[model samples]
Target chain A: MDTGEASYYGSRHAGLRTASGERYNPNAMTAAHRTLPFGARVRVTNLDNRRSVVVRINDRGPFRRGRIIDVSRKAAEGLGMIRSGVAPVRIESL
Target chain B: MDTGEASYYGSRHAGLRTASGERYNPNAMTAAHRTLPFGARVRVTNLDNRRSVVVRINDRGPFRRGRIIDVSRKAAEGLGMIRSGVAPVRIESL
Candidate 1:
């Protein structure tokens, strides 16, 4: 739905209850978008490698400006951005 | 293509070279299958939750008899089996 820098939650947030009231599983294909309703699924594609992953929005905020979404560690891995920590990405509602 | 227990590689195996000559990234949607050639993609579904993920076979073996496939951590999470560490799954070539 939007496009911008993408980041991921670190192990610190793992197991914490998210805005949706679900415990955050870093392994899950989930993400955080400031405004997308909880449970909304969006396909996030890393512009760097063209890798994409569909993740459900379960929480809020990248808390940082210039970031559109914050994905779970697994989703970030699929996008091949674990090394970079952040990547320019495109988000499309699915 | 098969039906049996599905397990995942542990952190200890992360970054290790796979039989396919690719470095294992536990976060990637990849898996190890006994016979499926490298690059073969299969949809593996956890019978308990009906959650599924399509993973490319890039390595071999669960080594333990009766286990049909070994998925990456990301795929295992998608199948909702990280808690149990293994789950009864059905695999279909895709």
Candidate 2:
């Protein structure tokens, strides 16, 4: 089984500007990290009540402060929060 | 007719806690109910900012306290929080 684990956020990739910089895609199971290398798989867990999901770091993100990462629509749903784009979560690596 | 929308939490199933006394199953798409009926299908929208996913209530719970409902693993993943877990969400039945 795909443990879906790898690095849990926290690298803080500093000078990221995506080669394309296109709008975030909600359909894909991806997220933006301040510093993790592209393609890193980490588990983003919702802390509001304890739910977690694994997402690939395809894009650079959370330019928004106080945020660790941003995930795709499908991921948001699996994590249990499509309505509230932002949920307190932890991203861990496998 | 399953827009997958019905009740949105708050019934507060004041008297909850599964008769099974089993652990909350993460793979099942079921959730602990504070009040919703056992078969109620509701869209649990996370309010951290935005993100929503639908979940079915097959059991009763959060008996641990301070929770509206505890969702299954698939539901938890769709909701996007399989790691840190817990997320603030809105639940409405269909």
Candidate 3:
């Protein structure tokens, strides 16, 4: 399990190609992790709201040192972190 | 483009191996389509509510005629079709 801040992809990245060679879709439940292999499914839970969502790791990111993952907009919505933009999260590989 | 009914995976299918060779995770924004290639991302819109979501085609089925797609629970929620169990939707390749 990994614990840290999580962020979501911005609208500007909606159709950009990702590290996995797939185009980014803000509405998809996908995420970028520094080391998780492409296609890895991880459960991300918002520490504050206790809401969680499963996301496939299809890119590499969260480039900021303190952020462990960068999730898609949909995932962020499910985690109830859209308003905050970034939130404390716990990630567990599934 | 395709227009038809869309259904969601049932809880019993959680963790089952999908046609794409990945374990099904109902919380991910994924869907099973009759013919879309695996990994193909498509936009699905619930006609009733105008709610839409992007989903990656990762499995196969709806298995029932007239139902063109089977989305994961998360995708279903985003499309605002959770309560109906199934909804009329329009799909477009992205």
Q: Tens digits of per-residue lDDT for model 1 on B1-94?
A: 7799877753324556899999877679998888998999899999999999999999987666668888876777688775565689999998
Docking class of 2: incorrect
Top of the candidates by lDDT: 3
Stretches of candidate 2 above 4 Å error? Answer: A1-24, B1-94
Better of 1 and 2 by TM-score: 1
Backbone clashes under 3 angstroms, per model? 1, 68, 0
- Model 3 misplacement above 4 A: B1-94
Residue A64 alpha-carbon offset, candidate 1, angstroms: 32
Chain A superposition TM-score per model: 0.96, 0.70, 0.98
Please provide, for model 2 over B4-48, each residue's C-alpha lDDT reduced to its tens digit, 9 standing for 90 to 100.
211221111112244344433434556656667666777787665
Candidate 2 chain A, run of 10 with poorest lDDT: A5-14
Chain B superposition TM-score per model:
0.96, 0.65, 0.96
Alpha carbon deviation, residue A37, candidate 1 (Å): 50
Which has the better lDDT: candidate 2, or candidate 3? 3
**lDDT on C-alpha atoms for all candidate structures:** 0.79, 0.53, 0.80
